[PDB]
């Protein structure tokens, strides 16, 4: 679900897309976070900003 | 937790990983072509195999989200792009042999040479035939290639056809030709579905509509080549194949120097102006940038200028260099060129930059749908940039073409003839080749008869007769890179029809009058916005609809082809009223 | 498009009902204005009013 | 780029141009029928050709917007209304011959006579009981007209069938059913064969009591003609007082149930009141407004001419309702102070009132749901005005007038001679025409099948069967010309179904001819809303809404005549009941 104002959710629990109970990663089980790829050659909308 | 919601989660993850993994592959490929090293080969191989394994695994996972249960449509289409089994159904020994035979056919084509009266066919022998004035050398070259290389490709070509058909059955198609036709199918639309059979029928009906220009153009070409070699070529008979100057039969550019309407009339060539004006090659690229801004399309990113490598690597980096546009992912757009201060490089620069205008607009869509509406749109739109680059209005306004230039109808005819001979002369060739490949994959024609059928199709469809009879051992179509390799030729025909339909659609938005070759798209910001409205859609929307919003038709029409060459068609008719029109398929140097 | 409060429009630009430009009238080229035709015998909702 | 959007823009344009040209045509035609002169003929023909030319161009353009891509059923139906090619599909030489034939057939109809044809031939038969005089007039006219009518009728039928085939119909009879079947809608579709069978089944369900009327009338003819009428076989057609066979009404003076019971009437009150044409219509308006039907506006009253203007500006004295469009509604009639004119004023007012209601819709839908509803609504208000309770309510019927059942029986018999006697004949004629257009009967057998089916369906036959040389059916005005007779039979039932719903709204217990459906404002307002539907909502739903069924309803007709059928049952015990086809007056 969506976060509340100023809420900081730092959970690392694996999210399961389906009904089947899932532990760890799997076919329909994914880590909530994804990394950004920052490289000096990426375009303006993909570059990192502080 | 139903199929649509899980499919949405799955594809979003796939698009993130796909951007990073393809990017690693695209970087390795760029860096390799820029600088040829052992390390760059390992980067290409590692990124390629990891990305491919990634795609195979995600396709397998895609199979657990049935297409028929999804009501979202956008993810449905993304899954349709991902769901095709490819090699996963085909038996392991057939898959291994199919990859081995494709690599072998490519290797033989690119390494097999034709020993001089030894030389590689592409580009060496083709260049000699194109520049040579002795038809006996071209005839020898065709026979020598069949004797030296055709015998190496034939038995493998036959096995290749069978192995591709087996894959096509594994993918639930009648043959591999049908598999290629399937690239043009859509579904889930309001009466926009085209079938594979309809694609073939549309091509044949379009050719029946095209034919008057092809026949008047051909009668002119055939008679001029006859006058060039009157002791060999019949005034009634069709032209011999070796005379084309292109071992493949695709490019009729090598006949132009013999068919020039007037020896004294020039073609437009602004190379001398750029040299006299001391313009840099990167300036003609910057002028093309100015053109794109003027049309009304997005401006080019700074990342392009910094990441692109437009000049020839020379002798500093070991390199492979040719014009090509790259989309590396995540906003990284660049062009690789061997740029020269010449008109040919200018039109190429417009072609390749236009390809980046499209990749920049395609970036609005998810990675898996980050492509054009169909296979032939990319080159067709680059050709749209090329056609506006070629017209004298464009060149004169920039200053590449002299400020005192005035139109000379005979010069326009010389330009139009060269262009029609290249662009139109190839059309019935491309068609008979696609159709031959289709019948070959279908299996309707026995393997031995295939060579007959090719010879008969050349004679019946384009007025080209092989000067030397050949047996089953030799294979004529295999002389083209794309026949020995895995390539669908329907897209060249389709690209060109898209190209002329686009020139008309943008001419109408531009509100220009006169012959369609006279009509430009420079400035004309209505045409810019009209074009921008499809560029942003790419592969995500039905290609038939994606073109429909611009061209205003359920299918493509020939009419812009005749409009482009209207002064040429009229001129050709005026000369053809006296010359013989048509060709005899009974005449043959063999006979 | 529809008019804004107190907006007046005196254009007679021909509307093209398809995806192509059109010069003059035609099968799907519609002139935006129509004339009136008033006769003394018309009904209350059809007679002219000032 | 969407077919529906382009179709809507097209139809809006169409409706404006169509309304202006419609007015021009209807006004020029009004002026001619109102004032007979060459100048109005010139305007009539020029405006009519202009309007038709407009429609053919609009049909050509309508065909460019396929019906299956339209999501708005109103738009889809309007396109369907224009896409039909009609007369434009038939080849030019076939069309030239077809039009020549129609004009020749009309000319022949008017050219022939009983050795002038109109109205004298029916006056001769209707006003004389001499068996031989009616027989002579019958044979004398058909012997002059049918010889020239047959070849042209047969060619007309073949050319119209070719037209229908070109329009994707099996034959022209099927074409007509195509015009009567509902289209432009989804899930209410009916088959043309089903419309045909539904009418045939309805006929067979009503027939068993019609045989009781037929036995009664045959016995009365026996009393008039003891030596010529068989109690078992078919009755002579010339004794009906109608050369065409359409009506049995001129037998009424012979068949009156109770001679001592005069029919209920108020004519004496209109004569003492001296109601003029405009007051007859305005009093009818008072009735119509109280019913709940829309009021007739001042424009109609000043523009209409309900009187005979005289010889200086002679009018065509055929009561008709005219819809000119753009609010211009008129009735042309030559009203006299009679009961037939009182009821006629109600028929044409209701007819134009239908036109008034449909004018609110788009032009293509400014047509009625069914041709039979305009006449049915008129007939309903006519019947309601005819009802003794109405005549008592208005106050024209004497304050001390007392109704009874036997007077109503005399009324019902006149109504039965008009409806019961005509329905099997008109039904038979429509089926006969269907067989000639369908091509079931060889041309040389068209009259033989007529004779055979006339014996089985109608029970009244030609006194002498005609020769194959002559086409007696084509001597009838509506047979010679392009006309479907399904609308007359079905219009009767349309009237009875509507009458049933109006009677139920009145909530009177008794026979349908007794219940007073005057006032009952809600019932008239509901009928008005049904009128407003025009072609926008199919006629089949209007009928379903009144009786609760897609099928035609047998019950209200038989319930209307039930006291009469009871009388007939009491007379049928003595008469032979049923028609034999073995005996005819000739044999
Ligand atoms: C598109 O429009 C621009 C102006 O917005 C044109 O640019 C001018 O071209 C003429 C050519 O002789 C020059 O003299 C002007 O100085 C240019 N103006 C500017 C501001 O650079 C351009 O030529 C137009 N395109 C074409 C093909 O005519
Ligand atoms: C091939 O694709 C179909 C979906 O069309 C899928 O059901 C089947 O399992 C796939 N087979 C393999 C081997 O991936
Ligand atoms: C487009 O980009 C070039 C990059 O050098 C810049 O000079 C030019 O002003 C830009 N034009 C617009 C309209 O942003
Ligand atoms: C080519 O790549 C290799 C390996 O990265 C590098 O050592 C070499 O200097 C490169 N060549 C040039 C000319 O930069
Ligand atoms: C070019 O124009 C001249 C007239 O100025 C005409 O004689 C000539 O035939 C034309 N050539 C073409 C190819 O139209
Ligand atoms: C009626 O007809 C006469 C013909 O003599 C004509 O003069 C007169 O103007 C007509 N009146 C109308 C109202 O059409
Ligand atoms: C009319 O009603 C009276 C009531 O007594 C009855 O005797 C008579 O038979 C009825 N007549 C008919 C025709 O029903």
Cα(D160)–Cα(B109) distance, integer angstroms: 71
Taking residue D25's Cβ as centre, other Cβ atoms within 10 Å add up to 21
Give Rg (Cα) of chain B.
Answer: 24
Cα(B506)–Cα(B532) distance, integer angstroms: 11
D69 interaction partners in chain B (CB closer than 8 Å)? 191
Determine the straight-line distance between the first and last CA of chain D, rounded to whole angstroms.
Answer: 72
E strand segments, B13-154 = 113-114, 119-120
Beta-strand relationship, C29-30 and C15-16: antiparallel
Q: Which residues, 6 or more positions from B192, have their beta carbon under 8 angstroms from its beta carbon?
A: B186, B542, B544, B545, B548
Residue B394, ligand 1, Cβ within 6 A: yes
Give Rg (Cα) of chain C.
Answer: 16
Structure tokens at D374: 């305009």
D567 known member of a binding site: no
A28 interaction partners in chain B (CB closer than 8 Å)? 6, 9-10, 64
Structure tokens at C30: 């519609």
Cα(D397)–Cα(D404) distance, integer angstroms: 14
Burial C2-27 (b: 16+ CB within 10 A, else e): eeeeeeeeeeeebeebeebeeeeeee
**Residue B346 parent element (H or E):** helix B343-362
| Angle, alpha carbons D372-D376-D381 (nearest 5°) | 160
Measure the CA dihedral D29/D30/D31/D33, to 10°.
80
DSSP B13-33: HHHHHHHHHHHHHHHHHHHHH
Structure tokens at D347: 């028929």
Structure tokens at B187: 């579904």
Residue B294, ligand 1, Cβ within 6 A: yes
- Could you tell me if B307 and A41 are in contact, meaning their C-beta atoms sit under 8 angstroms apart? yes
Which residue in B1, B10, B20 is closest to A19 by CB distance?
Answer: B1
Taking alpha carbons only, the member of D462, D449, D446 closest to residue D584 is D462
Structure tokens at D526: 């509901």
Residue B316, ligand 4, Cβ within 6 A: yes
DSSP state of D322: E
The nearest CA of chain B is from the CA of A19 a distance in Å of 6
Helix axes D423-438, D172-180, angle to 10 degrees: 120
Distances (CA, A) of D233 to D437, D458, D461, D584, D585: 30, 12, 10, 6, 8
- Could you tell me if B353 and B289 are in contact, meaning their C-beta atoms sit under 8 angstroms apart? yes
DSSP state of B237: B
Beta-strand relationship, D235-236 and D460-461: parallel
Taking alpha carbons only, the member of B95, B93, B17 closest to residue B55 is B17
- Could you tell me if D575 and D214 are in contact, meaning their C-beta atoms sit under 8 angstroms apart? no
- Could you tell me if B448 and B155 are in contact, meaning their C-beta atoms sit under 8 angstroms apart? no
Q: Which residues, 6 or more positions from D438, have their beta carbon under 8 angstroms from its beta carbon?
A: D170, D171, D173, D174
Residue nearest to atom 4 of ligand 7 (CA): D405
Three-state SS at A2: coil
Check whether the bond before D119 is cis (ω within 30° of 0): yes
Determine the straight-line distance between the first and last CA of chain A, rounded to whole angstroms.
Answer: 26
E strand segments, D413-528 = 460-461
Helix axes D339-358, D277-291, angle to 10 degrees: 50
Taking alpha carbons only, the member of A23, A28, A27 closest to residue A13 is A23
On whether any CB of chain A is under 8 Å from the CB of B307, the answer is: yes
The CA D530 to ligand 3 mean position distance, Å, reads: 68
| Angle, alpha carbons B454-B457-B460 (nearest 5°) | 150
Measure the CA dihedral D524/D529/D535/D541, to 10°.
-80
Contacts made by residues C26-30, CB under 8 angstroms, sequence distance 24+: C27/D61, C27/D64, C28/D6, C28/D9, C28/D10, C28/D64, C30/D9, C30/D13
Cα(B403)–Cα(D261) distance, integer angstroms: 112
Cα(D385)–Cα(D339) distance, integer angstroms: 10
Count CA atoms within 13 Å of residue D329 on its CB side.
Answer: 25
Cα(B491)–Cα(B199) distance, integer angstroms: 11
- Could you tell me if B145 and B247 are in contact, meaning their C-beta atoms sit under 8 angstroms apart? yes
Q: Rounded to an integer, what is the distance from CA B163 to the centroid of its chain?
A: 25
Taking alpha carbons only, the member of D29, D34, D27 closest to residue D308 is D34
- Could you tell me if B333 and B507 are in contact, meaning their C-beta atoms sit under 8 angstroms apart? no
The CA B198 to ligand 3 mean position distance, Å, reads: 45
Taking residue D106's Cβ as centre, other Cβ atoms within 10 Å add up to 13
Distances (CA, A) of B192 to B187, B543, B544, D322: 8, 9, 6, 48
Main-chain dihedrals φ then ψ at residue B116, nearest 5 degrees: -60, 155
Cα(B325)–Cα(B345) distance, integer angstroms: 14
Sorted by where each begins, the domain ranges of chain D are 1-587
Taking alpha carbons only, the member of D11, D9, D14, D3 closest to residue D71 is D3
Structure tokens at D42: 């010139």
**Residue D331 parent element (H or E):** strand D328-332
Alpha helix stretches (DSSP H) within B366-425: 377-390, 392-398, 409-423
Q: Which residues, 6 or more positions from D303, have their beta carbon under 8 angstroms from its beta carbon?
A: C41, D328, D329, D330
Look at B508 and C18 and tell me if their CB atoms are within 8 Å: no
Main-chain dihedrals φ then ψ at residue B324, nearest 5 degrees: -165, 145
**Annotation says B383 is catalytic:** no
Cα(B243)–Cα(B227) distance, integer angstroms: 13
Q: Which residues, 6 or more positions from B346, have their beta carbon under 8 angstroms from its beta carbon?
A: B270, B274, B284, B288, B389, B400
Do chains A and D touch, with touching meaning 3 or more CB–CB pairs less than 8 Å apart? no
- Could you tell me if D253 and D240 are in contact, meaning their C-beta atoms sit under 8 angstroms apart? no
Cα(D321)–Cα(D281) distance, integer angstroms: 13
Cα(D407)–Cα(D413) distance, integer angstroms: 10
Check whether the bond before D327 is cis (ω within 30° of 0): no
Cα(D453)–Cα(D246) distance, integer angstroms: 15
Main-chain dihedrals φ then ψ at residue B348, nearest 5 degrees: -65, -40
- Could you tell me if D11 and D362 are in contact, meaning their C-beta atoms sit under 8 angstroms apart? yes
Cα(D166)–Cα(D88) distance, integer angstroms: 10
Cα(D540)–Cα(D544) distance, integer angstroms: 6
Cα(D426)–Cα(D432) distance, integer angstroms: 10
Cα(B386)–Cα(B344) distance, integer angstroms: 10
Cα(D14)–Cα(D21) distance, integer angstroms: 10
DSSP state of B405: -
- Could you tell me if B336 and B323 are in contact, meaning their C-beta atoms sit under 8 angstroms apart? yes
Beta bridge partners of B239: B464
Taking alpha carbons only, the member of B269, B191, B258, B265 closest to residue B226 is B258
Contacts made by residues B205-208, CB under 8 angstroms, sequence distance 24+: B206/B497, B206/B556, B206/B558, B207/B427, B207/B428, B207/B431
Structure tokens at B369: 């749908």
Contacts made by residues B142-147, CB under 8 angstroms, sequence distance 24+: B142/B241, B142/B242, B142/B247, B142/B466, B142/B467, B142/B468, B143/B467, B143/B468, B144/B114, B144/B115, B144/B117, B145/B114, B145/B121, B145/B247, B145/B479, B146/B468, B146/B470, B146/B474, B146/B475, B146/B476, B147/B474
Q: Which atom of ligand 7 is nearest to the CA of D405?
A: 1
Taking alpha carbons only, the member of D232, D122, D534 closest to residue D361 is D534
Structure tokens at D493: 């039932």
Chain D residue whose CA is closest to C41 = D328
Cα(D411)–Cα(D419) distance, integer angstroms: 12
3-state secondary structure B266-330: CCCCCHHHHHHCCCCHHHHHHHHHHHHHHHCCCCCCHHHHHHCECCCCCCCCCCCCCCEEEEEEC
**Residue B334 parent element (H or E):** strand B332-336
Burial D218-229 (b: 16+ CB within 10 A, else e): bbbbbeeeeeeb
Taking residue D564's Cβ as centre, other Cβ atoms within 10 Å add up to 26
Residue nearest to atom 4 of ligand 6 (CA): D37
Structure tokens at D312: 């200086």
**Annotation says D348 is catalytic:** yes
A42 interaction partners in chain B (CB closer than 8 Å)? 303, 330-332
Main-chain dihedrals φ then ψ at residue D513, nearest 5 degrees: -80, -10
B16 interaction partners in chain A (CB closer than 8 Å)? 34
**Residue B451 parent element (H or E):** helix B449-457
Cα(B558)–Cα(B501) distance, integer angstroms: 8
What resolution in angstrom units was achieved for this structure? Answer: 2.9
- Could you tell me if B510 and B521 are in contact, meaning their C-beta atoms sit under 8 angstroms apart? yes
**Residue B455 parent element (H or E):** helix B449-457
Q: Which residue has the tokens 């082809």?
A: B561
Taking residue B288's Cβ as centre, other Cβ atoms within 10 Å add up to 23
DSSP state of B87: G
The nearest CA of chain D is from the CA of C5 a distance in Å of 25
Q: Which residue has the tokens 């309508």?
A: D62
Q: Which residue has the tokens 């035709």?
A: C37
Three-state SS at A30: strand
- Give the largest Cα separation in chain A, rounded: 42
Cα(B140)–Cα(D356) distance, integer angstroms: 90
E strand segments, D199-245 = 235-236
Beta bridge partners of D323: D329
The CA B284 to ligand 3 mean position distance, Å, reads: 15
The CA D224 to ligand 7 mean position distance, Å, reads: 26
Taking residue B354's Cβ as centre, other Cβ atoms within 10 Å add up to 28
Structure tokens at B532: 């921008």
Q: Which residue has the tokens 């997005």?
A: B298
Cα(A39)–Cα(A41) distance, integer angstroms: 5
């Amino acid at each position: 679900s969506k976060l509340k104002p100023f809420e900081r959710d730092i959970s690392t629990e694996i999210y399961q897309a389906g009904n089947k109970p899932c532990k760890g990663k799997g076919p329909n089980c994914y880590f909530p976070l994804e990394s950004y790829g920052f490289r000096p050659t990426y375009g303006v909308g993909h570059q990192p900003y502080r | 937790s139903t199929i649509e919601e899980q499919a949405k989660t799955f594809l979003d993850k796939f698009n993130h990983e796909a951007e990073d993994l393809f990017y690693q592959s695209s970087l390795a490929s760029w860096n390799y072509n820029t600088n040829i090293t052992e390390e760059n080969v390992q980067n290409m191989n590692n990124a390629g195999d990891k990305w491919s394994a990634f795609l195979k695994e995600q396709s397998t996972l895609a199979q657990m989200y049935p297409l028929q249960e999804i009501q979202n449509l956008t993810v449905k289409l993304q899954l349709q792009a991902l769901q095709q089994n490819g090699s996963s159904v085909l038996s392991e020994d057939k898959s291994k042999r199919l990859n081995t035979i494709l690599n072998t056919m490519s290797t033989i084509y690119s390494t097999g040479k034709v020993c001089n009266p030894c030389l590689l066919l592409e580009p060496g022998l083709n260049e000699i035939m194109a520049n040579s004035l002795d038809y006996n050398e071209r005839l020898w070259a065709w026979e020598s290639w069949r004797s030296e290389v055709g015998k190496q490709l034939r038995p493998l070509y036959e096995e290749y056809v069978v192995l591709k058909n087996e894959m096509a059955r594994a993918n639930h198609y009648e043959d591999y030709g049908d598999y290629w036709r399937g690239d043009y199918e859509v579904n889930g639309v309001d009466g926009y579905d085209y079938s594979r059979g309809q694609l073939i029928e549309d091509v044949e009906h379009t050719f029946e509509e095209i034919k008057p220009l092809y026949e008047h153009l051909h009668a002119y070409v055939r008679a001029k080549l006859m006058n060039a070699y009157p002791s060999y070529i019949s005034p009634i008979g069709c032209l011999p194949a070796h005379l084309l100057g292109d071992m493949w039969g695709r490019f009729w550019t090598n006949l132009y120097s013999l068919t020039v309407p007037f020896g004294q009339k020039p073609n437009i060539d602004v190379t001398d102006a750029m040299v006299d004006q001391a313009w840099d090659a990167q300036r003609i690229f910057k002028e093309a940038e100015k053109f794109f801004v003027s049309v009304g399309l997005p401006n080019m990113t700074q990342g392009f200028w910094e990441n692109s490598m437009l000049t020839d690597p020379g002798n500093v980096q070991k390199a492979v260099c040719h014009p090509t546009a790259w989309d590396l992912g995540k906003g990284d757009f660049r062009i690789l060129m061997c740029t020269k201060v010449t008109m040919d490089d200018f039109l190429t620069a417009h072609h390749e930059m236009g390809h980046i205008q499209y990749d920049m607009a395609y970036a609005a869509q998810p990675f898996l749908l980050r492509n054009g509406a169909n296979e032939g749109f990319h080159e067709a739109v680059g050709e749209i940039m090329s056609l506006s680059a070629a017209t004298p209005k464009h060149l004169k306004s920039i200053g590449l073409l002299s400020p005192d230039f005035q139109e000379d109808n005979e010069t326009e005819i010389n330009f139009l003839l060269k262009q029609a001979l290249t662009i139109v002369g190839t059309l019935p060739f491309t068609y008979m080749l696609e159709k031959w490949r289709w019948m070959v994959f279908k299996g309707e024609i026995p393997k031995d008869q295939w060579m007959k059928k090719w010879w008969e199709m050349k004679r019946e469809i384009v007025g080209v007769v092989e000067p030397v009879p050949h047996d089953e051992t030799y294979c004529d179509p295999a002389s083209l890179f794309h026949v020995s390799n895995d390539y669908s030729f329907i897209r060249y025909y389709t690209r060109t029809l898209y190209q002329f339909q686009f020139q008309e659609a943008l001419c109408q938005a531009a509100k220009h009058e006169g012959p369609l070759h006279k009509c430009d798209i420079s400035n004309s910001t209505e045409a810019g916005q009209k074009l921008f409205n499809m560029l942003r859609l790419g592969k995500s929307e039905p290609w038939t609809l994606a073109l429909e919003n611009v061209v205003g038709a359920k299918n493509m029409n020939v009419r812009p082809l005749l409009n482009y060459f209207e002064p040429l068609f009229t001129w050709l008719k005026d000369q053809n009223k006296n010359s013989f029109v048509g060709w005899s398929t009974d005449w043959s140097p063999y006979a």
